[PDB]
């Protein structure tokens, strides 16, 4: 729950820029390989992918975090561990999540959903995130 996850006062304007990182572009597509527009407007192209010693972590910049509810990210039909690293306040409202990706992975699905306050819940059952280039970690940097 992104609405609930951005509550943590500790994550309010926390640092998440210190790291050997790379700019990697991507496309957000639906079940018919058409530009999934809501996500296209919300998520940032390109995604900053940070390098570690084990696995490279991709950071996603999602806007309107107050409306974003569910946001599960799967690699090869397996749920990756998503975590909030930082969050911007009411007017900006950008939430920043990170998750590890295996070497060579270029595509990963996003099962997500939005909800304005306690209103109707809009479900997005399938959203494919295709990178322009396969993600490869670099422990040397």
């Amino acid at each position: 729950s992104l609405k609930d996850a951005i509550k943590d006062p500790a994550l309010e304007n926390k640092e998440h820029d210190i790291g050997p990182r790379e700019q990697v572009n991507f496309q957000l597509l639906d079940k018919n390989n058409e530009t999934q527009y809501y996500h296209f407007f919300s998520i940032k192209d390109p995604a900053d992918v940070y390098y570690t010693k084990k696995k490279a972590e991709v950071e996603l910049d999602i806007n309107t975090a107050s409306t974003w509810k569910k946001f599960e990210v799967y690699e090869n039909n397996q749920k990756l561990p998503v975590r909030l690293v930082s969050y911007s306040p009411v007017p900006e409202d950008h939430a920043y999540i990170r998750f590890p990706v295996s070497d060579g992975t270029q595509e990963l699905k996003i099962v997500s959903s939005t909800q304005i306050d306690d209103g109707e819940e809009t479900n997005y059952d399938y959203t494919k995130l295709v990178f322009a280039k396969p993600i490869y970690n670099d422990p040397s940097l």
Binding site: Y37, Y38, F41, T67, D93, T114, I116, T122
Partner: protein, 140 residues
């Protein structure tokens, strides 16, 4: 002030328009000219005939401007910096004309998307379009 609820509705509604942005934007202009002949003053050297090539082409440019605004709704004045200078400093367009186009856009979206055009989304779009009008009409 655009709330997170307003920001969400605008993204969703404009996302449901999708690939028909230029087609809707071209329609919106065509409605403004016929309904409000006073808006034709700013387009003297333009073919404003029925089903024109320039009007159809200009609708895409306006639709792409809205796409850029919706994509960068968190920071609109910087996103529409160059486009603000044109409508504010150079062309000096009257704010009243933007409200006519804003109305014509809402009528276009209402006609094509009946299921998505809910009273809440109506409020968000009119509020969003009023904000983009303020950015373009204001001098920085």
């Amino acid at each position: 002030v655009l709330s997170p609820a307003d920001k969400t509705n605008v993204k969703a509604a404009w996302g449901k328009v999708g690939a028909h942005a230029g087609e809707y934007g071209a329609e919106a202009l065509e409605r403004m000219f016929l309904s409000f002949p006073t808006t034709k003053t700013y387009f003297p050297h333009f073919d404003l005939s029925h089903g024109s090539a320039q009007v159809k082409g200009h609708g895409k440019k306006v639709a792409d401007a809205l796409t850029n605004a919706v994509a960068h709704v968190d920071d609109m004045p910087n996103a529409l910096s160059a486009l603000s200078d044109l409508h504010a400093h150079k062309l000096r367009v009257d704010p009243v004309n933007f409200k006519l186009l804003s109305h014509c856009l809402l009528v276009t979206l209402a006609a094509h998307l009946p299921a998505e055009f809910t009273p809440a989304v109506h409020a968000s779009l009119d509020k969003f379009l009023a904000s983009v009008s303020t950015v373009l009409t204001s001098k920085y």
